[PDB]
């Protein structure tokens, strides 16, 4: 039984965690094979963060700037490279450690396992989810950046996060390891706010099927609707309104538990539209949006 | 800024994990140095816990009964003995992977990592603490038998749960990897319940000493209280009663934080007799107990491990 926000075994990622140091910054980097990946405004500094100019910035630099430490030893860089917010850096031994590795972009509602970095070595690992404003919640403070997410599925390591800044909301932002920022956030100490938040209206359902498995029943009703109808209530409580892929995925919990999607969308509604009670569900007197359906298949 | 449920990082007990099989039941290990440690009840067949008497199950194995695996590797076992519910497997080959551990027992109200293992393969992590009737509210299926839970402080591993069974109630409970219980329970299949609980008062106000750092500062008045005018409202809420020592691990957030803890104590007061009125706690509709000031602090300041 049991249910639990449970993050990956980040064994693979810690092996791969450098400290790299570029004038008086000091970020961690992800050291994957010859090269050490880690977001390109450790060459910018508070002066120049308003507005750089990367290219004519990384044209001024050398390998002598760069300053990598694998633990008690200094990596030797031959290569400095851009790909768009992600710097990369070729070096000339590969780390021992390497998995079997991807890079992916994920889709909003997502969940991926972060590994906390300060200084190169690991502080924690905890369980985030991309929001529908492209942010994230995680707990990061200041030379957080270059902290990855991820997601071990079989021995393959899916990379898909890169933490860069945090948002004046708390919030945090990224990009894939590719450099493309989640959103339409810019590498940049520019003005930059979050758009409101929508809950996972999938995630959500997820989660309640879940609690049906491990036995709690108390929100389910004999009422179903139509899906018009739900998104309809949805948005009203600020829901995220729910596809029919939405619908389709919700599927294989369907068959497991005998309650149809939109039988259980009903259950949902009437929850909204009353409140907790003072009830619990798996522990939570909320409602959890961090469980896509996936996980709940994974750890059920 | 931000706070997130925050495990250690798995690393260095992903190195240790073994599968081991005895006759028709297989389960997880823990492969420190040249000896493994699993739970006594895997030489048991369900026909066996009925009724188990197992001294005499072991002197019945021999050395080669025991189908031990690290990943493809198959370990050679040179002998067995029993430490209370946990069985000692000696095998030929030192695990070049040991890191620097240590067995420690946690007292109630304690948390800890515990990585989620399944046929000696490492499946998930999260934080547990230990419950104050000795249970942990975790996820566990069958083959979870063998998962640990433990520390990481300085460079040093603490080992400190190994967890056996299931109660009824969906809640786990286990050893302290000497093979000693937590908690009033034995390691057969015969009508075993977790006893009442009671929430971890001082978990309670490092976690609202967090919403104050991240912001979330709703909660605080003007007032102050005293631990025996709280700790009588303590009982009657079936909380936990707040001793001295508590007070003075709370020292540290008073300090970076700036509020008193008796300060802080009477906005758990008050809290826990009016309710949250709709308000959230670092979007949480209910109090956290499962955040110690320890765990706060290795939030608050990043404390990074080697
Ligand atoms: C000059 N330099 C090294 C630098 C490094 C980081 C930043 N920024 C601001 C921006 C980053 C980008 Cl990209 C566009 S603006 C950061 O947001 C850093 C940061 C990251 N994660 C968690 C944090 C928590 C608290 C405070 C923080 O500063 C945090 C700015 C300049
Ligand atoms: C025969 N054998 C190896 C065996 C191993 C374990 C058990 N037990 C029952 C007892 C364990 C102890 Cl100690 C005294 S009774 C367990 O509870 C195991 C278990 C653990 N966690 C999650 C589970 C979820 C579903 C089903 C489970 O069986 C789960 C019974 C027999």
């Given at each position: ?44 500094t508070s002066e120049d963060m ?139 100490q ?111």
């Amino acid at each position: 039984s049991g249910f639990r926000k449970m993050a990956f075994p980040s064994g693979k990622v810690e092996g791969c965690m450098v400290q790299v140091t570029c004038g008086t910054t000091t970020l961690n980097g992800l050291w994957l094979d010859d090269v050490v990946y880690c977001p390109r405004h450790v060459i910018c500094t508070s002066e120049d963060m308003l507005n750089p100019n990367y290219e004519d910035l990384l044209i001024r630099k050398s390998n002598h700037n760069f300053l990598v430490q694998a633990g008690n030893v200094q990596l030797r860089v031959i290569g400095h490279s851009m790909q768009n917010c992600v710097l990369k850096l070729k070096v000339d031994t590969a780390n021992p450690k390497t998995p079997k590795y991807k890079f992916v972009r994920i889709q909003p509602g997502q969940t991926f396992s972060v590994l906390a970095c300060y200084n190169g070595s690991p502080s924690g690992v905890y369980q985030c989810a991309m929001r529908h404003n492209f942010t994230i919640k995680g707990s990061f403070l200041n030379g957080s950046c270059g902290s990855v997410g991820f997601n071990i599925d079989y021995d393959c390591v899916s990379f898909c996060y890169m933490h860069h800044m945090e948002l004046p909301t708390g919030v945090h932002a990224g990009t894939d390891l590719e450099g493309n920022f989640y959103g339409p956030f810019v590498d940049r100490q520019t003005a930059q706010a979050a758009g409101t938040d929508t809950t996972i209206t999938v995630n959500v359902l997820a989660w309640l099927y879940a609690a049906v498995i491990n036995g709690d029943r108390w929100f389910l009703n004999r009422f179903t609707t139509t899906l018009n109808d739900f998104n309809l209530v949805a948005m009203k409580y600020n829901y995220e309104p729910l596809t029919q892929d939405h619908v389709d995925i919700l599927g294989p919990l369907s068959a497991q538990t005998g309650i149809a999607v939109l039988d259980m969308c009903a259950s949902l509604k009437e929850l909204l539209q009353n409140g907790m009670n003072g009830r619990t569900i798996l522990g939570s007197a909320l409602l959890e949006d961090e469980f896509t359906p996936f996980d709940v298949v994974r750890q059920c």
